[PDB]
Every structure is written in C-alpha cells, then in structure tokens.
Write an enzyme that holds these catalytic residues in place. Sequence first.
Site, PDB file in Angstrom:
ATOM      1  N   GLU B  27       0.820  -1.174   0.000  1.00 42.59           N
ATOM      2  CA  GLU B  27       0.000   0.000   0.000  1.00 42.59           C
ATOM      3  C   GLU B  27       0.864   1.237   0.000  1.00 42.59           C
ATOM      4  O   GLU B  27       0.593   2.127  -0.710  1.00 42.59           O
ATOM      5  CB  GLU B  27      -0.996  -0.002   1.157  1.00 42.59           C
ATOM      6  CG  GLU B  27      -1.830   1.250   1.287  1.00 42.59           C
ATOM      7  CD  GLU B  27      -2.673   1.572   0.066  1.00 42.59           C
ATOM      8  OE1 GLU B  27      -3.161   0.680  -0.613  1.00 42.59           O
ATOM      9  OE2 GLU B  27      -2.835   2.738  -0.225  1.00 42.59           O
ATOM     10  N   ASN B  31       1.506   4.173  -3.273  1.00 36.58           N
ATOM     11  CA  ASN B  31       1.500   5.611  -3.161  1.00 36.58           C
ATOM     12  C   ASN B  31       2.837   6.216  -3.606  1.00 36.58           C
ATOM     13  O   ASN B  31       2.871   7.198  -4.271  1.00 36.58           O
ATOM     14  CB  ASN B  31       1.178   6.055  -1.741  1.00 36.58           C
ATOM     15  CG  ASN B  31      -0.229   5.771  -1.346  1.00 36.58           C
ATOM     16  OD1 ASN B  31      -1.101   6.542  -1.614  1.00 36.58           O
ATOM     17  ND2 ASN B  31      -0.450   4.659  -0.706  1.00 36.58           N
ATOM     18  N   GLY B  84      -6.689   1.791  -4.100  1.00 38.63           N
ATOM     19  CA  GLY B  84      -6.253   0.955  -2.983  1.00 38.63           C
ATOM     20  C   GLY B  84      -6.853   1.427  -1.672  1.00 38.63           C
ATOM     21  O   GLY B  84      -7.716   2.319  -1.650  1.00 38.63           O
TER      22      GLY B  84
HETATM   23  C1  LIG Z   1      -2.212  12.560  -2.268  1.00 41.44           C
HETATM   24  O1  LIG Z   1      -1.338  11.456  -1.921  1.00 41.44           O
HETATM   25  C2  LIG Z   1      -1.827  10.571  -1.044  1.00 41.44           C
HETATM   26  O2  LIG Z   1      -3.009  10.441  -0.821  1.00 41.44           O
HETATM   27  C3  LIG Z   1      -0.753   9.764  -0.430  1.00 41.44           C
HETATM   28  C4  LIG Z   1       0.539   9.871  -0.731  1.00 41.44           C
HETATM   29  C5  LIG Z   1       1.654   9.071  -0.197  1.00 41.44           C
HETATM   30  C6  LIG Z   1       1.517   8.031   0.738  1.00 41.44           C
HETATM   31  C7  LIG Z   1       2.608   7.275   1.137  1.00 41.44           C
HETATM   32  C8  LIG Z   1       3.870   7.556   0.625  1.00 41.44           C
HETATM   33  O3  LIG Z   1       4.983   6.866   1.034  1.00 41.44           O
HETATM   34  C9  LIG Z   1       4.025   8.585  -0.292  1.00 41.44           C
HETATM   35  C10 LIG Z   1       2.931   9.333  -0.685  1.00 41.44           C
END
Ligand SMILES: COC(=O)/C=C/c1ccc(O)cc1
EC number: 5.6.2.2
Lengths: 185, 188
Positions: B27, B31, B84
């Site tokens: 997950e 992202n 996701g």
């Molecule tokens: C708008 O972006 C989201 O909702 C999430 C971003 C995001 C989550 C984990 C990561 O390691 C890098 C970016």
Amino acid sequence: LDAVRKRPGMYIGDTDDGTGLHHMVFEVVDNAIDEALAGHCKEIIVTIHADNSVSVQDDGRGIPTGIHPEEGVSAAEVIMTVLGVGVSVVNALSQKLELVIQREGKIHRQIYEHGVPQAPLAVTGETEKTGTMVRFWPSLETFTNVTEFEYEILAKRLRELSFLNSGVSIRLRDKRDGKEDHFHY
Amino acid sequence: LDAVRKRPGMYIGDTDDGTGLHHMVFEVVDNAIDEALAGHCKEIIVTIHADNSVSVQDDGRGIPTGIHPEEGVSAAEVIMTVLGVGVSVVNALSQKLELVIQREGKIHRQIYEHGVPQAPLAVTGETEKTGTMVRFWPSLETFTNVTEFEYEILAKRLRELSFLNSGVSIRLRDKRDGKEDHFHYEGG
Ligand SMILES: COC(=O)/C=C/c1ccc(O)cc1
Ligand SMILES: COC(=O)/C=C/c1ccc(O)cc1
Ligand SMILES: Nc1nc2ccccc2[nH]1
C-alpha cells in the site's frame, strides 16, 4: 475519539502532574452518581486496584444496551466511543476499559483497549440486580510521571460530592493498603 | 480511523498469516510509485530495517504540507488520518509511523503512533531535494503470528511492479543481512 487522543490535555487536564489522571476517575464518578440517583439504594463504590486501575460500580438502572438506531451499535458503545467531558474521554485514554452492565435481568460485558472495542457488547449471563460497572487502566502512553492513583486526592473530591449529592452513598476502597472510607450525607 | 482499528481485517486483510503485514508495505509502495511517476528521475527505495520496520522513500514532489482549509491541520496529516486502501489504513495499524516530506526548499517531519499524530507537521530544516519518506513499524497488537517481513515476498512483487511502471527505479534493501536488489525496467 482521535481528537481526544491527539490532544488529551485539552480534554482531561495535565497529563504529567497527576491532574489528568485523577480527573479520569472524577469523570467516571460523575456519570456513576447520576446513575445512582435514578435507582433505589443509591450507592457507588470506587476502588483503587493493586494493579493501578480504578473501578466504579453503581446500583442504577444500567446504561442502555439496545442498538442505537443511528449508529448501529449498542447504546453503551455509542456512549463509550462518541464525543462534563464524557466517559468517551476516559475510554480513549485508557489502555484497557472493562464495562459490565446489569439490566433487564441480563449481564452484559465489553472490553476496550485505547477506546477501541474488542468485541460488541454481549450478554454473558442472568442477574437479579441492576447497575453499571466501569474499570479502567489509564494509558501509560498518555499519563506520565504521576502514574499512580493517590488516595487522598480521590477522597477529597468524593467528600465534596457527597455533600452535593445527598442520599447517595459513596464508598472508597484501596486494595493496595486496605484503606477505606464512606461518604454519605 | 476508529472504524479501521475496530475491524482491521476488513481493511488490510488477514492479520495472522502474513498477508496483511506485507499488504502494509504494498500500500505504501503504491502511493510512492504514484509520487515517483509525477517526477522525472523517478526512484523509490524500499528498506527493511533491523527493527522490523519498513521505509519507502520517493523522489516525488512531496505530499502537500499546507494547512487544509476545512480540516485545520496540514494536508499530509489529513491524508494520514482521514480514510487501494489508503495510507491512513497503514498508519492506523502501525504502532509507529515516521513521515518525512521534502518540499519547497524545506524538510517536514511528523511522527504518529497507532495513527495518532504526536505533534503537528513541522519544518525542521532545509533541502534542495524533493520527496516523501514513510517508515512504519507494524502494530504487534494487530499483527499476530507472522510479524517479520520476508524479503522474497517483497522482491517478487516489486519485480512484477517494475514492469508495469516504466522508468521507475525500485531499489530493495534488507539491512538485516545486506541483501540488495534493483528493479528497473525501461519500456516505452
Ligand atoms: C495525495 O497522496 C496521497 O493520498 C498519499 C501519498 C503518499 C503516501 C505514502 C507515501 O509513502 C508517499 C505518498
Ligand atoms: C446513560 O447515561 C450515560 O451516559 C451513562 C454513562 C456512564 C454511567 C456509569 C459510568 O461508570 C460511566 C458512564
Ligand atoms: N487507538 C490506539 N491508540 C493506541 C495506543 C497504544 C496501543 C494501541 C492503540 N490504539
């Protein structure tokens, strides 16, 4: 409850000097006292257990157990999980919370950790009594430095309450060293 | 977040056979790949640390850090705490989560425990680079029986993913034993 978890001081009081810690007890006590008013005998029992938890028993009618029409869970659960500060605050800041409701001939139990229910409120047996019992173990991630209940702090406040809630018997027991008191005006 | 905490199984999958545990990593990676895809050099680094946490670093533009108009906290915090499956699920089921955002010349840092922010997102310093690093320690109150990451499961998936994401460099590092892998597919 996340709002309480992120700023616990803003809901319960100072979390390092014992203020908040004791207010956890007082919040439960306020709810218990109002239960006791509405059901014959009118007594609460506040116990400091050797493991540093505090239990508060009332002989009231029992918190309602039926499914809340809008939230989809028991009414007791709504009370413990949805934002006088409210018992939801105590639950959120408790590493463990035990709830026992005696109502309509039935014993109901539920356990929470950090305010999250471990299972739904469940009927565990039959009883002739009514009442609500809440035992909580304050989270040590929130409560620092002063982490042990001080008897006299609890005694002072309960004494004040007895005068204000006439006819309500308030018992205080300390299982660590056998100390006990009985406030009744 | 309490809905996740209440029934973790429904969100992350099975919390007992290792499936859910590794899904936490994937997950985050998803992202991270979305972040890396919006930049030009496009790289992600997945590290299994010796304390059985995993970090994922991207060189994207950085998760936005300005205060959200209606939520009253930084946009990053809104993303981490409002569901996701969403990174908020990973945060909720993590005993610790460390967030590092490099953006607009500034380093931003925040720590969460069981999804609860310990302090508001803070500018701690300066930087010439950009990106988002998330490092999480899985909650051992949630994840039982299988609690340690299996390198091979991560490598297999990250290899498959590399073919679906052209130009994205994916590095896998295991600090427990020194094992390393680089999956980089240039297609298109
Ligand atoms: C708008 O972006 C989201 O909702 C999430 C971003 C995001 C989550 C984990 C990561 O390691 C890098 C970016
Ligand atoms: C039904 O009214 C309520 O909200 C009752 C709450 C309540 C009663 C006893 C206790 O020890 C803690 C909370
Ligand atoms: N919501 C929440 N906060 C927590 C803190 C410690 C362990 C489990 C937890 N769940």
